[PDB]
Amino acid sequence: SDFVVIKALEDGVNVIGLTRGADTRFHHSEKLDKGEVLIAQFTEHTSAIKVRGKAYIQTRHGVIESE
Amino acid sequence: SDFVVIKALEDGVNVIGLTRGADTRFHHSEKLDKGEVLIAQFTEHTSAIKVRGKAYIQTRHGVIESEG
Amino acid sequence: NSDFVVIKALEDGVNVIGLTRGADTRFHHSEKLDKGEVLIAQFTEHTSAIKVRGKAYIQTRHGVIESEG
Amino acid sequence: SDFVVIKALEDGVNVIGLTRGADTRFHHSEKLDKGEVLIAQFTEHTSAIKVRGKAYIQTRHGVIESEG
Amino acid sequence: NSDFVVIKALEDGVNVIGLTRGADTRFHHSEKLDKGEVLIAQFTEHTSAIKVRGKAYIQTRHGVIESEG
Amino acid sequence: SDFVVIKALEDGVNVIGLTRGADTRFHHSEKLDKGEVLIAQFTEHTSAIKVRGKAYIQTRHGVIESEGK
Amino acid sequence: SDFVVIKALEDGVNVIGLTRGADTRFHHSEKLDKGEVLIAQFTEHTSAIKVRGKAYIQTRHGVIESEG
Amino acid sequence: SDFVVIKALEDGVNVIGLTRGADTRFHHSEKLDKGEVLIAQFTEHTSAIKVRGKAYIQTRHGVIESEG
Amino acid sequence: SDFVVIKALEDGVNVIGLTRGADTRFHHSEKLDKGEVLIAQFTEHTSAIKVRGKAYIQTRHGVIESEG
Amino acid sequence: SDFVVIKALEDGVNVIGLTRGADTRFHHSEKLDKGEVLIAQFTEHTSAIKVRGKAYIQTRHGVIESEGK
Amino acid sequence: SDFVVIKALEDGVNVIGLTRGADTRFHHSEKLDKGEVLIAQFTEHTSAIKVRGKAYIQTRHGVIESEG
Numbered sequence: 001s002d003f004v005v006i007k008a009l010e011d012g013v014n015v016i017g018l019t020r021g022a023d024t025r026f027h028h029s030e031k032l033d034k035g036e037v038l039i040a041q042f043t044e045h046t047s048a049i050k051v052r053g054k055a056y057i058q059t060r061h062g063v064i065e066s067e
Numbered sequence: 068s069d070f071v072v073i074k075a076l077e078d079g080v081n082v083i084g085l086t087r088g089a090d091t092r093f094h095h096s097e098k099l100d101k102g103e104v105l106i107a108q109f110t111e112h113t114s115a116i117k118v119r120g121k122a123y124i125q126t127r128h129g130v131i132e133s134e135g
Numbered sequence: 136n137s138d139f140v141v142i143k144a145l146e147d148g149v150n151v152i153g154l155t156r157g158a159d160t161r162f163h164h165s166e167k168l169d170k171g172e173v174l175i176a177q178f179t180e181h182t183s184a185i186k187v188r189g190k191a192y193i194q195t196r197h198g199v200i201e202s203e204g
Numbered sequence: 205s206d207f208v209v210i211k212a213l214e215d216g217v218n219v220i221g222l223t224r225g226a227d228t229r230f231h232h233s234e235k236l237d238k239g240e241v242l243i244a245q246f247t248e249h250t251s252a253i254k255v256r257g258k259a260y261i262q263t264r265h266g267v268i269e270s271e272g
Numbered sequence: 273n274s275d276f277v278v279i280k281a282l283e284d285g286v287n288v289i290g291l292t293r294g295a296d297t298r299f300h301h302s303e304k305l306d307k308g309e310v311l312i313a314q315f316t317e318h319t320s321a322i323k324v325r326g327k328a329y330i331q332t333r334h335g336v337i338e339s340e341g
Numbered sequence: 342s343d344f345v346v347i348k349a350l351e352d353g354v355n356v357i358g359l360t361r362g363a364d365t366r367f368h369h370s371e372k373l374d375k376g377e378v379l380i381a382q383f384t385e386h387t388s389a390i391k392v393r394g395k396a397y398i399q400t401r402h403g404v405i406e407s408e409g410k
Numbered sequence: 411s412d413f414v415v416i417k418a419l420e421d422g423v424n425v426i427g428l429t430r431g432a433d434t435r436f437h438h439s440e441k442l443d444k445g446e447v448l449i450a451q452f453t454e455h456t457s458a459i460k461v462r463g464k465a466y467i468q469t470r471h472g473v474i475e476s477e478g
Numbered sequence: 479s480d481f482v483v484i485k486a487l488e489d490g491v492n493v494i495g496l497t498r499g500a501d502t503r504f505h506h507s508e509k510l511d512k513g514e515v516l517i518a519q520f521t522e523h524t525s526a527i528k529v530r531g532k533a534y535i536q537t538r539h540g541v542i543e544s545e546g
Numbered sequence: 547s548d549f550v551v552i553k554a555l556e557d558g559v560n561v562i563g564l565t566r567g568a569d570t571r572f573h574h575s576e577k578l579d580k581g582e583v584l585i586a587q588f589t590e591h592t593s594a595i596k597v598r599g600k601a602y603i604q605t606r607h608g609v610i611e612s613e614g
Numbered sequence: 615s616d617f618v619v620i621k622a623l624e625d626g627v628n629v630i631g632l633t634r635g636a637d638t639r640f641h642h643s644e645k646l647d648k649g650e651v652l653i654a655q656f657t658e659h660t661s662a663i664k665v666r667g668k669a670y671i672q673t674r675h676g677v678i679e680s681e682g683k
Numbered sequence: 684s685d686f687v688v689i690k691a692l693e694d695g696v697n698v699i700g701l702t703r704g705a706d707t708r709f710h711h712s713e714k715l716d717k718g719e720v721l722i723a724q725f726t727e728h729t730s731a732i733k734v735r736g737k738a739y740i741q742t743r744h745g746v747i748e749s750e751g
């Protein structure tokens with residue numbers, strides 16, 4: 001199953017997981033401080049991922065940056 | 068399953084999931100504020116995704132941009 | 136796990152039309168896009184062909200093609 | 205499962221689906237007007253596709269053009 | 273999910289002949305193409321070999337080849 | 342499943358299927374005259390293919406030529 | 411299943427496994443000292459990994475560096 | 479499933495199929511005259527193939543040439 | 547499964563397997579002397595591998611070096 | 615399943631298949647003379663292959679050459 | 684399933700299988716003299732392979748050389 005790499009470029013970045021299934025809501029928000037990296041898969045419980053805050057992101061489709 | 072990356076280039080962008088199945092309707096709209104990124108899969112419940120508003124989108128077939 | 140098509144409307148009133156899978160072929164849904172909206176649409180248990188009408192920039196795994204209104 | 209892209213270069217381009225199975229005949233003809241695009245899969249019901257008329261065609265093996 | 277061949281007729285009366293899969297081998301269908309028409313034909317449960325007669329431009333996963341009439 | 346493309350470069354080329362299994366024998370010989378093309382799979386019944394006669398051959402390993410008699 | 415390579419560039423780097431499932435929490439934190447390498451899979455129990463401290467990281471998507 | 483192409487560079491090239499299983503011996507020998515081509519798979523009954531005589535051979539790992 | 551190559555660049559390099567499962571602990575420590583090479587899979591019992599000591603390592607993701 | 619290509623570069627080359635399982639021993643030694651090519655798979659019964667004698671070898675990882683005593 | 688190629692560069696090189704399973708111990712040591720080549724899979728019984736002595740090694744990750 002595929003994954004996303006997120007590197008926080010500032011304190012307070014949120015990596016938020018969205019529920020798989022008929023309904024869509026946030027079930028977890030992981031806080032990243034500056035320089036921390038999270039590598040996060042899609043899973044049985046998480047079919048969409050939202051990033052809030054400034055971070056460097058890598059996926060299979062290349063690099064993108066949130067602000 | 069494939070996924071799409073959507074980065075909102077202005078406030079109020081909507082990423083809209085359309086129902087899988089014989090019926091087609093919107094089941095969810097995720098609102099993105101400028102500079103937020105959403106990475107969203109195709110799923111048992113979502114077989115088409117629509118984006119409204121200004122955004123930079125990546126998929127397996129390359130970059131495309133939506134404009135508001 | 137199926138393939139998908141990206142459609143970006145280059146004018147108002149673009150229609151992305153889904154054709155039914157199976158022995159019966161007909162249109163079952165027509166999605167209206169206005170200028171600059173994007174639809175990323177899979178082939179599905181219900182949709183085995185997709186017709187685009189109106190001016191649009193389309194990406195498939197075979198590359199770019201453009202429809203003209 | 206594979207698909208063919210068909211872009212009509214004139215009115216009345218006919219995309220013809222041939223039946224899968226021991227018998228071969230057409231079971232559907234989808235006409236396209238100039239500039240419309242049809243992205244059609246091979247399926248449980250369609251194992252061969254014929255294009256009549258002027259059309260620009262993409263498949264996994266590259267581009268080909270039909271002449272009407 | 274089988275492979276498919278692309279056949280473009282370069283003259284009228286090209287024949288794309290499907291041969292039967294299985295222990296026995298015979299022609300089960302000849303699809304006749306006129307000049308400029310394109311047939312995209314899979315290998316299937318019933319067709320394990322395809323013969324082209326007449327002048328045609330052909331694409332398969334191993335490249336381009338041309339039949340001559 | 343893999344296939345081979347055979348284009349006859351003279352009359353009377355044979356494309357010969359050998360039986361799959363513990364027994365090996367020819368079960369079919371498809372005659373090609375000049376300019377005809379056969380695109381033939383490996384199958385539940387054919388696990389080896391012999392070409393006799395002058396032909397241009399494509400497989401997934403590239404181009405090979407058989408030389409006639 | 412995919413894996414991530416982490417080389418500690420300073421002492422006390424923490425590679426933290428997050429639980430797979432409805433619940434998300436840290437179930438393990440592996441401490442690396444300077445110059446140690448950990449190569450770590452996604453698994454039945456671990457569906458996200460977090461690195462804290464200065465490290466050089468390789469994944470399928472290329473190289474990235476965490477900072478302390 | 480993999481296959482090899484064998485082109486005979488002289489008369490009487492011998493393509494030898496070795497039996498798959500705990501035992502090894504040849505179960506079939508197909509002779510090729512000069513210029514003939516055999517395209518042969520690995521199968522339930524053949525798990526090694528030997529070529530005797532001058533032949534031009536292609537496999538997934540490139541070209542090799544047997545000499546008589 | 548994926549495997550890692552580890553070449554000891556000094557004596558007493560440790561290639562340590564961490565248990566797969568809810569619990570994470572060392573189950574095995576393989577000591578390599580200078581110049582020895584260990585080629586080691588991920589497996590039913592081993593879902594993370596830690597290298598301590600100076601070594602040259604290859605993974606699908608490319609080269610990395612652990613240092614003493 | 616993977617296979618290795620072995621071309622003998624002198625008489626008397628041996629390609630030795632080692633048994634798959636908890637037990638490791640030689641179950642078969644195929645003797646090759648100069649110029650002959652063996653294309654051998656890994657199988658239910660053979661999980662390692664040893665080559666003794668001068669030979670030119672291809673595998674998915676590239677060319678390697680065995681040298682005889 | 685993958686394999687590794689080992690060419691011995693001097694006499695008495697040892698290619699050592701380590702047991703798959705909860706337990707890790709040797710199980711078999713194949714001695715290669717100079718110039719001999721062994722091509723060995725990962726298997727139900729072997730999940731790690733050690734090379735001791737001077738040898739040229741190829742894996743899917745490239746060339747590496749052990750030193751005695």
Ligand SMILES: N[C@@H](Cc1c[nH]c2ccccc12)C(=O)O
Nearest residue numbers: 019020021023047084110112113
């Ligand atoms: N609960 C939704 C979440 C989702 C995934 N991808 C989306 C795309 C758009 C909107 C919502 C989603 C689902 O599993 O289908």
Ligand SMILES: N[C@@H](Cc1c[nH]c2ccccc12)C(=O)O
Nearest residue numbers: 087088090091114153179181182
């Ligand atoms: N409910 C439709 C939604 C859909 C997916 N792709 C489409 C293409 C065109 C029109 C509708 C769609 C389906 O699951 O098949």
Ligand SMILES: N[C@@H](Cc1c[nH]c2ccccc12)C(=O)O
Nearest residue numbers: 156157160183221244247249250
């Ligand atoms: N209902 C038809 C639709 C179709 C798909 N590809 C086509 C090509 C030509 C004509 C019809 C089709 C099918 O599922 O087979």
Ligand SMILES: N[C@@H](Cc1c[nH]c2ccccc12)C(=O)O
Nearest residue numbers: 224225227290313314316318319
């Ligand atoms: N009914 C035929 C259609 C077909 C597919 N490919 C062909 C090639 C030649 C002739 C007919 C065909 C089949 O399913 O096999």
Ligand SMILES: N[C@@H](Cc1c[nH]c2ccccc12)C(=O)O
Nearest residue numbers: 293294296320358381384386387
């Ligand atoms: N009925 C034969 C047709 C065939 C396929 N490929 C061939 C190659 C040679 C001769 C015959 C064939 C089969 O299914 O096997």
Ligand SMILES: N[C@@H](Cc1c[nH]c2ccccc12)C(=O)O
Nearest residue numbers: 361362365388495518521523524
């Ligand atoms: N009956 C043999 C035919 C064959 C395939 N590949 C071969 C290679 C050599 C000799 C015979 C063969 C089989 O299916 O195994």
Ligand SMILES: N[C@@H](Cc1c[nH]c2ccccc12)C(=O)O
Nearest residue numbers: 427450453456566567569570593
């Ligand atoms: N017992 C843990 C080991 C592990 C794998 N990857 C990790 C990443 C971080 C922390 C622990 C791990 C598991 O199988 O999941």
Ligand SMILES: N[C@@H](Cc1c[nH]c2ccccc12)C(=O)O
Nearest residue numbers: 017040043046429430431433457
């Ligand atoms: N327990 C969560 C952990 C997780 C994986 N990826 C995520 C992305 C965002 C938030 C949480 C996660 C899950 O398995 O789904």
Ligand SMILES: N[C@@H](Cc1c[nH]c2ccccc12)C(=O)O
Nearest residue numbers: 498499501502631654657659660
């Ligand atoms: N009967 C043997 C034939 C064989 C395949 N590859 C080999 C390598 C070496 C020696 C014999 C073999 C087997 O199926 O395993």
Ligand SMILES: N[C@@H](Cc1c[nH]c2ccccc12)C(=O)O
Nearest residue numbers: 634635637661700723726728729
């Ligand atoms: N019987 C052993 C053969 C073997 C394969 N790979 C090896 C590597 C080293 C030593 C022995 C082996 C096994 O199947 O596992």
Ligand SMILES: N[C@@H](Cc1c[nH]c2ccccc12)C(=O)O
Nearest residue numbers: 563586589591592703704707730
């Ligand atoms: N018996 C161990 C062998 C092993 C494979 N990879 C390793 C890495 C480190 C330590 C031991 C191992 C296992 O099957 O898991």
